[PDB]
Structures are given as C-alpha cells and as structure tokens.
Amino acid sequence: MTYWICITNRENWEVIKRHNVWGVPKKHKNTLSRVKPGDKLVIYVRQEKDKEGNLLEPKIVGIYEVTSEPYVDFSRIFKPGGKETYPYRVKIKPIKIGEINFKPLINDLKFIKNKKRWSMHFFGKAMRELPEEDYKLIEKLLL
User: Fold this and answer.
1) H or E element: which one contains 137?
2) Cβ–Cβ contacts within 10 Å for residue 102, how many?
3) Best CA proximity match to 13, nearest among 51, 58, 67, 66
4) Partners of residue 142 on adjacent β-strands
C-alpha cells in the first residue's frame, strides 16, 4: 500500500469527517489516480486564523484508510470567490482521530528535505506520498 498526507483546512476537515470522503481538484487528478483501497491517509490542516485574527498553526488531525477506488462526483459538500467542488474522490474510513502540532515534527520528517523552507514540500499540492518511516512516526504520536 501507499501512505499519504492530505492537505486541507479546518472547514473542509469537518466535511471530510462527516462524509467520509477525500477529494481533490482536477489539476491533482493524476495523483489521486494512484490511490488504492487500503492506502493510509494522514489528514493535515494548514495554518489559518480565526475570525478574531488569532493564528491557528498547522497540525495533523487524523488518520484514515482508503476504502474505494477513485471516482468522480460533483456534489457540493465542500466549502471553498471560487467554486471548486473537489470532484475527484475516494471513500474513506477513520482509523484514529486526534490532533498534534505539525512544526515540532519537521526536523524528524524524512520527506521534508529543506527544513527552513519546508513549505516547498507542500506548495501547490493537494496530497503527496509519505515514506513509511514518516507515517509510523506520526501514527505513534497520534495513538
């Protein structure tokens, strides 16, 4: 199987949790075409800020397992000035739900070569593969 880290935000994480669906835009459809049942997904929410202006640092909020083959569905379950529906999807099921800050893990993460400019490894990506080592590290801290 393959391990993945999916990049979303807090508003969408709620939808993901309620609908058991992971979706991506057309640009990233090729990456999704590689996803298979049994693959594991690490859910990551990017850095944001509440309505009061306070900074909400990035963090991992859960681990899911893929249960379906990739398919297309334009239903409007997600929330984006744009109207992205994230039509390319795979069904999923939760394995573990809990949050841990992401930054403290940067140094120990293999897939992150450039620690100073780690954003480089997330830039313009919906999801990316995770070496097994990285997954296990995250799985433990999330048990």
Assistant:
1) helix 132-141
2) 20
3) 58
4) none
